[PDB]
From a paper:
AMPA-type (AMPAR) ionotropic glutamate receptors (iGluRs) are composed of pore-forming GluA1–GluA4 subunits (Dingledine et al., 1999) that coassemble with a variety of auxiliary proteins, including the transmembrane AMPAR receptor regulatory protein (TARP) and cornichon (CNIH) families (Jackson and Nicoll, 2011, Schwenk et al., 2009, Tomita et al., 2003), as well as CKAMP44 (von Engelhardt et al., 2010) and SynDIG1 (Kalashnikova et al., 2010), among others (Haering et al., 2014). Each pore-forming subunit possesses four principal domains, with the extracellular amino-terminal domain (ATD) controlling assembly and trafficking (Gan et al., 2015, Greger et al., 2007) and the ligand-binding domain (LBD) providing a bilobed agonist-binding pocket (Dawe et al., 2015). A network of electrostatic interactions at the apex of the AMPAR ligand-binding domain (LBD) is essential for gating by pore-forming subunits, whereas a conserved motif on the lower, D2 lobe of the LBD prolongs channel activity when auxiliary subunits are present. Our data identify a network of intersubunit atomic bonds at the apex of the LBD that are critical to channel activation with pore-forming AMPAR subunits.
In order to incorporate an additional electrostatic interaction across the D1-D1 interface, we used a Thr765 to Lys mutation to introduce a charged tether onto residues forming the opposing electronegative pocket (for additional rationale). Alone, this mutation had little functional effect, but coupled with the K759M mutation (K759M/T765K), current decay slowed several fold, and the additional mutation N768T (creating K759M/T765K/N768T, or MKT) yielded nondecaying current responses. Consistent with functional recordings of GluA2 K759M/T765K, our structural data also suggest that the crossdimer tether does not persist indefinitely. First, an additional crystal structure grown in the presence of lithium revealed that the electronegative pocket was partially occupied by a lithium ion and not the opposing Lys residue. Second, in MD simulations of both the double- and triple-mutant receptors, the T765K residue failed to make continuous contact with the electronegative pocket. Overall, these structural and functional data support the premise that the Lys tether is not a permanent feature of the T765K mutant series. As anticipated, lithium resided in the putative cation pocket for much longer periods of time, confirming that removal of Lys759 impacts the ability of lithium to bind. The substitution of external NaCl with LiCl caused a dramatic slowing in the onset of desensitization (τ = 50.0 ± 3.4 ms; n = 7; p < 0.0001) for wild-type GluA2 and yielded a nondecaying phenotype (n = 6) in GluA2 K759M receptors.
Author numbering:
A (entry chain A), B (entry chain A): 392 to 506, 555, 566, 632 to 774
Amino acid sequence: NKTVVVTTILESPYVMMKKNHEMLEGNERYEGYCVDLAAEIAKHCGFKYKLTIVGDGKYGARDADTKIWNGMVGELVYGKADIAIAPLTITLVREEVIDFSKPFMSLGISIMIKKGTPIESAEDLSKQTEIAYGTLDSGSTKEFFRRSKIAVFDKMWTYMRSAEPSVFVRTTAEGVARVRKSKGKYAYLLESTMNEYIEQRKPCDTMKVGGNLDSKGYGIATPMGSSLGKPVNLAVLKLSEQGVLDKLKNKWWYDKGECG
Amino acid sequence: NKTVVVTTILESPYVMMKKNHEMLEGNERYEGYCVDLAAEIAKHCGFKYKLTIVGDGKYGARDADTKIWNGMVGELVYGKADIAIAPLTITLVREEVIDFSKPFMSLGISIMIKKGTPIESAEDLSKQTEIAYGTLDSGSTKEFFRRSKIAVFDKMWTYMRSAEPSVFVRTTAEGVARVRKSKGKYAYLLESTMNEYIEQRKPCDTMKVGGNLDSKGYGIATPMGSSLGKPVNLAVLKLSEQGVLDKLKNKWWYDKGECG
Ligand SMILES: N[C@@H](CCC(=O)O)C(=O)O
Ligand SMILES: N[C@@H](CCC(=O)O)C(=O)O
Ligand SMILES: [Li+]
Ligand SMILES: [Li+]
């Protein structure tokens, strides 16, 4: 029937511009883990689709004042897209307003440092002031710190929320640049999936340190009650069980890694 | 209103008999990760409940001939329990017949050996015949091997399905005993969660080797369409985000580990 509108986000290696994108149109402009996953889910569910990059470049948060959702979550809530296929964390507040598949990838929050930075853990970050640290805006990592009752994470949030200049970034790439350019004086808190990808990219100057701070998952999201949710969830489980999700992770993370 | 009937399974450290169980009655007979999780979910959802150990001691599989489900899955499908709170793997075939929460624990299939056994991987097992290996009956690990199209896992299944004497066991404890007693000539394929627990128990003679073979999760299950599913799923996500699931994992795996 109708073309399914897929909201997604330009986040490497999930969705990236193809080298020759300026000559290409439509879905062919893009490549990556989520582009491949969208093709697999569409094939299993039997729909045609159009990939659309979220206008505001955000994952999704609800404004405390207006109660309005932004980002990909907002695109689903307000009826501007039919499905989100992206590294979108399954969270309580989001689950209350959109539907999610079972997870297609497991992850947790992690620490990225410039190589040689003397930090091995969140506790280490929390006990010093020389090295600044922050998170992405409008996403689940920022919310993790804002809501935590665990002393070390509350201490980190109390620092981050009032730090000057701001420690928060608008995109993962801006966080990576800040780590790379800050001579060891900025560390970035981000999901293990993104951190592990970046560690395999030139110039090979970052690394993931410490254990993950939490354990959670990304899911494919649909507007609440959409008939697409049920077949999409069954497709995710099938792809998981057939080993396809594992093959795609290796393809986009490790197969052409650049750091040895 | 009505007392919720919870089906569960005696699998350490998820549900275990308390030391003084012979003097105790009802839910007080039991302790463990799933006993604590049931209490937390009941508190958040506001129900009273009765823990019941599944009669046949199985997780759940569908008989190819009769199409009848056994185990905890069968208890839900046939209306004998209201909810399953257990280390029950979220799988495609189960998702088609019962509802599941988002996962409360992440895991994958793994290899348990007696210390000193010269095996480091599934590929190693598959390329030799001196060391026998098998899985639990009536569960998701056996089904993983039976359905895999990946050459190494298909080769392992072709061996396991015809091995004599049988390499399959009825309970995890029987698998552990077979590893411990077989002088290095049996290796057991089981979920990483169970393997990591057993590695911390006396006599400290087993170990987990190699990476996990897959990535998946346990969920709380309800009969399809039950009104309990929605609040239970929101409770799982809340407990996840508050760090309670992490606290319970540490409590039952590591806090009183016996092997250093
Ligand atoms: N996956 C996150 C974005 C990344 C982050 O917050 O670190 C989300 O869905 O909000
Ligand atoms: N968690 C598995 C049981 C253990 C196994 O198969 O290794 C299930 O739900 O079937
Ligand atoms: Li939801
Ligand atoms: Li289901």
